[PDB]
Amino acid sequence: GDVIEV
């Protein structure tokens, strides 16, 4: 899956 850091 993805790693999303915002």
Swiss-Prot record:
Location in the cell: Cytoplasm; Nucleus; Secreted; Lysosome
Domain of life where this protein originates: Eukaryota
Organ and tissue specificity: Lens as well as other tissues. Expressed in myocardial tissue.
Disorder cited: Myopathy, myofibrillar, 2: A form of myofibrillar myopathy, a group of chronic neuromuscular disorders characterized at ultrastructural level by disintegration of the sarcomeric Z disk and myofibrils, and replacement of the normal myofibrillar markings by small dense granules, or larger hyaline masses, or amorphous material. MFM2 is characterized by weakness of the proximal and distal limb muscles, weakness of the neck, velopharynx and trunk muscles, hypertrophic cardiomyopathy, and cataract in a subset of patients. Cataract 16, multiple types: An opacification of the crystalline lens of the eye that frequently results in visual impairment or blindness. Opacities vary in morphology, are often confined to a portion of the lens, and may be static or progressive. In general, the more posteriorly located and dense an opacity, the greater the impact on visual function. CTRCT16 includes posterior polar cataract, among others. Posterior polar cataract is a subcapsular opacity, usually disk-shaped, located at the back of the lens.
Its job: May contribute to the transparency and refractive index of the lens. Has chaperone-like activity, preventing aggregation of various proteins under a wide range of stress conditions. In lens epithelial cells, stabilizes the ATP6V1A protein, preventing its degradation by the proteasome.
Q: Which family does it belong to?
A: Belongs to the small heat shock protein (HSP20) family.
What is the annotated quaternary arrangement, including any partners? Heteromer composed of three CRYAA and one CRYAB subunits. Aggregates with homologous proteins, including the small heat shock protein HSPB1, to form large heteromeric complexes. Inter-subunit bridging via zinc ions enhances stability, which is crucial as there is no protein turn over in the lens. Interacts with HSPBAP1 and TTN/titin. Interacts with TMEM109; in the cellular response to DNA damage. Interacts with DES; binds rapidly during early stages of DES filament assembly and a reduced binding seen in the later stages.
> Which protein, by its recorded name, is this?
Alpha-crystallin B chain
Source organism per entry reads Homo sapiens
Q: Coverage of the whole protein, first to last residue?
A: 95 to 100 of 175
